[PDB]
Chain A
């Protein structure tokens, strides 16, 4: 089940920014659910929504950037405005929303695993990360780089945490053909193999040797493979045997 507010408190403040997902329009405006501050409905009247064909769009799926005007902190009533939000911090707001979404996505494995309420899990996550640091995505990033935030809280599920870490955390192939004619052979082959290994190396049938080289930062691959090939070439020519590289 999907519930629970993004921040620490249930109800929004004055002047703060929220992102809304629209469900239905006309008659009132948009009494719609929020994706920045809880799943409970918040309404805009048909005046603050538009500035500059207006009725033609705004149905299901489309997102609106809005500022909160009036909050009733007693039973549950939210008032919003679209016109006031200037296009200077809109990008920043969008970024924030994205970060929030990512955080929410991150808090799903736990929900899946131990079959317990999501809100409590969220609360348990938000106490070290969302409280002291500020925004949560950056904190998460920091943790993944250098463990610094997970120290403050004890884990009821360490395995789940490990899984999460794992989730948060390129193979190139080469061909070598061997066909000797000299005295010794198997030993030579072994030697050749030893010059082209360092991760995963496997044998297929007989004439071909297949090795997979792991790339650190995308472009890397030729800077070792070629050397290995050269070494192989150096190896086999001395005794009286021939090897080919396509």
Chain B
């Protein structure tokens, strides 16, 4: 078996205590770490998957196990692609992590249960978000199908079909698969091979890195001096890294808390890399890699720096405080249990603007008809245009309004 790492990212969406983690487990082999010291930093889940060919009726394709025995052929599998999974929870309070996950993702999998409530706005909202964030590769999957009646499922499918056609996602495949009884995943695997292609990626463009998770390597058992460096789980979109480069977290931090601040952002060199199971040399983008840099084990532990941009020495981007946004509004609101109508923008009110992955608070000053000027409270960086989703407040918690683009 060759040690070729991740190439393309696939994600999973749903609801709490429904069936996403179970699905992930079914897909993979080794159990995940996520769900204070271990794993606890962000609500996002990271898991891997295998694409192995064995082609030497119509539906049979490949087996997840390293050695296939169930169909018949005892031959050795062809290496085509290795993939990394990002698990994102659809809880009503926390969605920043989900948003962050979306930015790195290039394939989306929808999972809704069968033996519960049918019309849910959250799923629709998720779909809308997917449509917005540069995606056409949408696969619909049904979770709990085994505890369902003979025609009810069919009816549900029909209803779904009726619902979904007038969207950005054109020819979306719909597959019903069980996660608790372990069946029918072959079809899914086949689909994964068929529908999803690989976009071009080269060494030319300057590196862009996003760190979601943070880890510390301190476990009880050994004596006093048995220490390892701080590991930062960072996923790459474009820009290849080799061992021997300086990694920096962009926004910066306060040095004394009186006294003026002028200290540059935190620089760190790579000590030990963690990919799939163990160590590797080259970092091919399109996967979440636990990069172990010279950042403190005391710093990376809790909710302090979740979802921030990472650059390299040599190339310099720009940091902004006043942001410029062009907005597009929707007809009626998404993600509300009954539906409510969208009001026009009002001056002097706290609203949350999500640019790419960051969750930041913004205040409205001057809006004519298309352009919007906003004031930031927590630091944020700007590169090109980014995938922007707006969130406004009416009652209790956050609600989506529409999509946005930066004009410069």
Stretch touching chain A among B70-78, B124-132, B138-146, B293-301: B293-301
Q: Are B220 and A204 in contact (CB under 8 A)?
A: yes
B224 CB–A CB distance under 8 Å = yes
**Residues of B contacting A189 with CB < 8 Å?**
227, 296-298
B253 CB–A CB distance under 8 Å = yes
**Residues of A contacting B267 with CB < 8 Å?**
183
**Residues of A contacting B176 with CB < 8 Å?**
none
B266 CB–A CB distance under 8 Å = yes
Instruction: Report the interface size class on chain A.
Output: 20 to 34
**Residues of A contacting B218 with CB < 8 Å?**
203, 205-206
CB distance from A172 to the nearest CB of B (A): 18
In the complex, chain B residues 220-263 whose Cβ is within 8 Å of any chain A Cβ = 220, 224-225, 227, 229-230, 253-257, 263
CB distance from B167 to the nearest CB of A (A): 46
Complex CA distance for A203 and B224, rounded to whole angstroms: 6
Q: Are A185 and B298 in contact (CB under 8 A)?
A: yes
Q: Are A186 and B294 in contact (CB under 8 A)?
A: yes
Which listed residue (B224, B255, B296) contacts A186, Cβ 8 A?
B296
B170 CB–A CB distance under 8 Å = no
A144 CB–B CB distance under 8 Å = no
**Residues of A contacting B229 with CB < 8 Å?**
186
Known: A180-B296, A185-B296. A206 touches B216 (CB 8 A): yes
Q: Are B266 and A181 in contact (CB under 8 A)?
A: yes
Q: Are A183 and B294 in contact (CB under 8 A)?
A: yes
Q: Are A180 and B220 in contact (CB under 8 A)?
A: no
- A 233-246 to B, binary, CB cutoff 8 A, 1 in contact else 0: 00000001010000
A103 CB–B CB distance under 8 Å = no
Q: Which residue of A lies closest to B268 (CB)?
A: A183
CB distance from B73 to the nearest CB of A (A): 49
A3 CB–B CB distance under 8 Å = no
CB distance from B351 to the nearest CB of A (A): 31
CB distance from B396 to the nearest CB of A (A): 34
- A 158-198 to B, binary, CB cutoff 8 A, 1 in contact else 0: 00000000000000000000111111111001100100010
B37 CB–A CB distance under 8 Å = yes
In the complex, chain B residues 358-389 whose Cβ is within 8 Å of any chain A Cβ = none
**Residues of B contacting A179 with CB < 8 Å?**
298-299
> 10 closest Cβ contacts across the A-B interface?
A185-B296, A180-B296, A178-B298, A201-B224, A240-B255, A181-B253, A179-B298, A206-B218, A206-B216, A206-B301
**SS class of chain B's interface: helix, strand, loop or mixed?**
loop
Interface residues of chain A, those whose CB is within 8 Å of chain B, are 178-186, 189-190, 193, 197, 201-207, 240, 242
Complex CA distance for A184 and B266, rounded to whole angstroms: 10
Known: A186-B229, A190-B227, A203-B220. A181 touches B299 (CB 8 A): yes
Interface residues of chain B, those whose CB is within 8 Å of chain A, are 37, 216, 218, 220, 224-225, 227, 229-230, 253-257, 263, 266-268, 294-299, 301
Q: Are A207 and B224 in contact (CB under 8 A)?
A: no
Known: A180-B296, A206-B37, A240-B255. A186 touches B220 (CB 8 A): no
Known: A181-B255, A183-B267. A207 touches B298 (CB 8 A): yes
CB distance from B87 to the nearest CB of A (A): 25
Q: Which residue of B lies closest to A178 (CB)?
A: B298
Complex CA distance for A181 and B256, rounded to whole angstroms: 10
Complex CA distance for A59 and B268, rounded to whole angstroms: 84
**Residues of A contacting B266 with CB < 8 Å?**
181-183
Instruction: Using A186-B227, A193-B224, A201-B224 as known contacts, list a sample of 20 further A-B pairs with CB atoms less than 8 Å apart, ordered by residue number in A.
Output: A178-B296, A178-B298, A179-B298, A180-B299, A181-B266, A182-B266, A183-B294, A185-B230, A185-B296, A185-B299, A186-B229, A186-B230, A189-B227, A197-B224, A203-B218, A203-B220, A203-B224, A205-B220, A206-B218, A206-B297
Complex CA distance for A93 and B348, rounded to whole angstroms: 95
**Residues of B contacting A190 with CB < 8 Å?**
225, 227
Complex CA distance for A182 and B295, rounded to whole angstroms: 9
**Residues of B contacting A182 with CB < 8 Å?**
266
**Residues of A contacting B224 with CB < 8 Å?**
193, 197, 201-203
**Residues of A contacting B256 with CB < 8 Å?**
242
CB distance from A40 to the nearest CB of B (A): 59
Central interface residue in A183, A189, A204, by most chain B CB within 10 Å: A183
